[PDB]
Amino acid sequence: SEELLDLFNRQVTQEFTASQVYLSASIWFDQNDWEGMAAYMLAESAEEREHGLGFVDFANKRNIPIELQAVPAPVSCAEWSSPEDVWQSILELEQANTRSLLNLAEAASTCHDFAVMAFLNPFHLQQVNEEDKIGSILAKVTDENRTPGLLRSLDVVSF
Amino acid sequence: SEELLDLFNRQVTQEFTASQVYLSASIWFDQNDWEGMAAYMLAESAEEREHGLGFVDFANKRNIPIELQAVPAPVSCAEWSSPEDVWQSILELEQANTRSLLNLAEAASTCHDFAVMAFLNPFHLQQVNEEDKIGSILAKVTDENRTPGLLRSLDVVS
Amino acid sequence: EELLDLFNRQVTQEFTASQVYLSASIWFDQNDWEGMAAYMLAESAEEREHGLGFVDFANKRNIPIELQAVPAPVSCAEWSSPEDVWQSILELEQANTRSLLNLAEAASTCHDFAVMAFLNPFHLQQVNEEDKIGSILAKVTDENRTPGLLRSLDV
Amino acid sequence: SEELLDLFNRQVTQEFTASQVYLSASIWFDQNDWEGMAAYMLAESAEEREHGLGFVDFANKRNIPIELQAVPAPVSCAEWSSPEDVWQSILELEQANTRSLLNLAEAASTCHDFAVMAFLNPFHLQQVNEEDKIGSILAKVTDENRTPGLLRSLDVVS
Amino acid sequence: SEELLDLFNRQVTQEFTASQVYLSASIWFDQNDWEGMAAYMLAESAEEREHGLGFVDFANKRNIPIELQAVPAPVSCAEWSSPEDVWQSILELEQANTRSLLNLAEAASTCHDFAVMAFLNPFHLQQVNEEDKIGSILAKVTDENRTPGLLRSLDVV
Amino acid sequence: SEELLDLFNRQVTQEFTASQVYLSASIWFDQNDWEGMAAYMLAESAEEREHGLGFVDFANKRNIPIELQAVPAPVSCAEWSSPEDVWQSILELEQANTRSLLNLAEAASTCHDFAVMAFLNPFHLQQVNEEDKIGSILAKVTDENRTPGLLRSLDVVS
Ligand SMILES: [Zn+2]
Ligand SMILES: [Zn+2]
Ligand SMILES: [Zn+2]
Ligand SMILES: [Zn+2]
Ligand SMILES: [Zn+2]
Ligand SMILES: [Zn+2]
Ligand SMILES: [Zn+2]
Ligand SMILES: [Zn+2]
Ligand SMILES: [Zn+2]
Ligand SMILES: [Zn+2]
Ligand SMILES: [Zn+2]
Ligand SMILES: [Zn+2]
Ligand SMILES: [Zn+2]
Ligand SMILES: [Zn+2]
Ligand SMILES: [Zn+2]
Ligand SMILES: [Zn+2]
Ligand SMILES: [Zn+2]
Ligand SMILES: [Zn+2]
Ligand SMILES: [Zn+2]
Ligand SMILES: [Zn+2]
Ligand SMILES: [Zn+2]
């Protein structure tokens, strides 16, 4: 059925888009001397690409034809002015990855596609851990940034 | 030297664009049961991604501002009907990557940007190896494909 | 020949920079920034190795070297905080980058491909050092906004 | 003496001429994307040069004056249009290296030069092994080349 | 251009010519019982051949057509009489090959051939180290040969 | 007090001055193809700089203000024309540095500065060893330089 095929392709695009947006965050961090937060975003960019590639591989195995779409330019970088803005956009990015996965799971449930649902399970649990972790980092950032220089003092350690 | 900063940015785009094209080739091979050619392309896709990241890292160190551009949808895949069409497209892709590196070096030379020229030196030599390698694979593919089934034999001898 | 002049001058620049890093190490130590002082001391040794590297290449290439005086560092009398020191160190490295580029430009006019090849790893090294220094100065300047917080990070 | 000193010098030229012909073959193979055959010819070029050096070293010990001659430009490479042509020329090169050693041994025998004859023994036996190996490769080449693409699938293997 | 391709092809001939001239030096040293110097020249003959093979390999990768030329017979050897004569010819051989590399780089530079320039960099630096090493052996040889027999000491390396 | 703190400050200049003059000797030897003597001088150059840095470190610890002075250009190198000239200058350099440490210890002695005197003890014993070592190399050099070529054939050994 075509909607499942459509949503499956859209997931690939969403993971590669997340990959670029994480890469954009690394660059912002780096240009602004937050080497540790830049390292973390770089590692996450590589991880989102791996998610994308796992969907491509599953799709190839299951005969779901994939046609790669444009990966848009990240644009939030234009307006980030502190680490708190960057981490807030990364949280929103991950909340969007979770919504597209839940959409995909909903369509497969409708279609009684037990294999796609089994395939998605570890991704549902990984988004739980990912949102939890970003939420935690954002809480620390917005707390420590209430004292000048304190946040920097902790890029240096943690990350 | 706005020209240099522009060519440096576009170089990131070209490496990430090549990564996507290699990924599209890996998908087309996979869908047509060329698993060995698919893993080869998938490896090259990750490697093009690493090149781009290496440009980004250098640009960050040298205060060359990077803004990531869209990576366009690959479109050669619509038209491939055999492994030879894919490998031909990958050859032309690398020849465009080579051209683009050489343009960027020309711009660096003109600016006397010696750091940029030194940074590019190993990429120039890498392109020489990459085109040679593809050229040789395309020669073998084009020869073996003259007998039905024989090319299939050598996907597996990989 | 401007190329020989400049090559012999690069030796002096490296040893000059070695002494400026040693001066920074002294100011840090005297003001109880041991971490920062350790760091400048290791960079002082490193500049000296760059100078020895130019002397060795020149000897091999028959570029006559005559050692000049190594000028006294002048910036230390003015430094009042770690920000002043790291700022002067950034300028010192910028000056050295400029001087390696002018050397490479003379070598390029003369078609001296060997000297150009010899300089390549130095050009790339300067890019990494200016980046590292810029990044440390950024942290210093941010952390110094809260009394005593910078100390937390030397240590 | 005379005849023996001249032939011993000529043998040095012959080994190094052979080294260069093998190198010409490696280049032709490489330019036409036969990497495995190319590697084999490169490995043989180095080994011919070693034979050459072995003669020089023996001559030096036995006070035979060596004057190094021009090593001629390889010319068969102008004519090669497939792998079979290259292997054929290599087989004929080795049959002439064999002739040259046998002629040397002949002059040594006449002069009753037992040390020279002892020195050449392993080379005569090595020529037997070389002509046999090349004959056998040329047989396989000319058999595989009867199906388009098949030869290529076996540069890749062997 | 014609020129850059002619020069690359010739550079192979240059490295193989240097290989034979080092072989000719080893032979002269061996015939004159300078075993240590003979072994040095023999190892340098192999290395020049490796340089030539390095150019051939690059040329194949880069589609620069190579046709091997004759490697001329070594000439200096007929007139060497003492180790100083040999070392001086070897220095001159190395100086010539440095000029031949700089001329190739210049041709590559005119054509904006960045790949050939990059490929050449380690060879330019290698020449600097070779000329230096030979110049220094030659200074020692011409100093020790002032006392009869003493230079036999350099040889027992 | 003033005189002691000044002499301590200027001991740093004397060590760094000695470092540069060793470096200059290493350059003269290298330029004249005495690589063995050049390596020896280079290593002593690094050692004189470590002695300087030992003074700086102790001064930092004992709150003796250090103001780094110009390190003078070495000038003996303009008149050196044989290895014996270089080694004789190096000997005078070390005798000068010994006198310079003894004066420092004498000022510390008048000041009852037991810490400085303890700090200096191993430097005094090091100067003894260095003078003896250089005296000994100089005697060998002067003796061997009586026969042309002979000194050369001992840079090579050592
Ligand atoms: Zn960075
Ligand atoms: Zn993650
Ligand atoms: Zn994901
Ligand atoms: Zn994610
Ligand atoms: Zn598959
Ligand atoms: Zn690759
Ligand atoms: Zn690339
Ligand atoms: Zn590529
Ligand atoms: Zn201290
Ligand atoms: Zn430096
Ligand atoms: Zn530096
Ligand atoms: Zn090849
Ligand atoms: Zn063989
Ligand atoms: Zn042979
Ligand atoms: Zn043979
Ligand atoms: Zn011998
Ligand atoms: Zn060479
Ligand atoms: Zn050479
Ligand atoms: Zn030297
Ligand atoms: Zn000392
Ligand atoms: Zn001393």
Author numbering:
A (entry chain B): 1 to 159
B (entry chain F), D (entry chain E), F (entry chain H): 1 to 158
C (entry chain C): 2 to 156
E (entry chain A): 1 to 157
Manuscript text:
Zinc ions are competitive inhibitors of ferritin and bacterioferritin. Crystal structures of Zn(II)-inhibited ferritin confirm that this metal binds to the ferroxidase site and site C. The zinc ions are coordinated by the same residues as seen in the structures from aerobically iron-soaked crystals. Glu-130 is predominately coordinated to the zinc ion in site C, although in three of the monomers of the asymmetric unit, Glu-130 adopts two equal occupancy conformations, one that coordinates to the zinc ion in site B, and the other that coordinates to the zinc ion in site C. Furthermore, the zinc ion at site A is modeled as coordinated by two water molecules, one of which is bridging to site B. This arrangement of coordinated solvent is similar to that observed in the iron-soaked structures. An overlay of the zinc structure with the iron structures showed that the zinc atom in site B is slightly shifted toward site A and that the zinc atom in site C is closer toward the core as compared with the iron. Thus, the use of Zn(II) and likely other metal ions as analogs of Fe(II)/Fe(III) may not identify the correct binding sites in other ferritins.
A novel ferritin was recently found in Pseudo-nitzschia multiseries (PmFTN), a marine pennate diatom that plays a major role in global primary production and carbon sequestration into the deep ocean. Ferritin is a 24-mer that forms a hollow sphere, takes up soluble ferrous iron, oxidizes it at di-iron ferroxidase centers, and stores the iron oxide mineral in its central cavity. Sites A and B comprise the conserved ferroxidase active site, and site C forms a pathway leading toward the central cavity where iron storage occurs. The structures confirm the typical ferritin arrangement: 24 subunits assemble to form a hollow spherical shell.
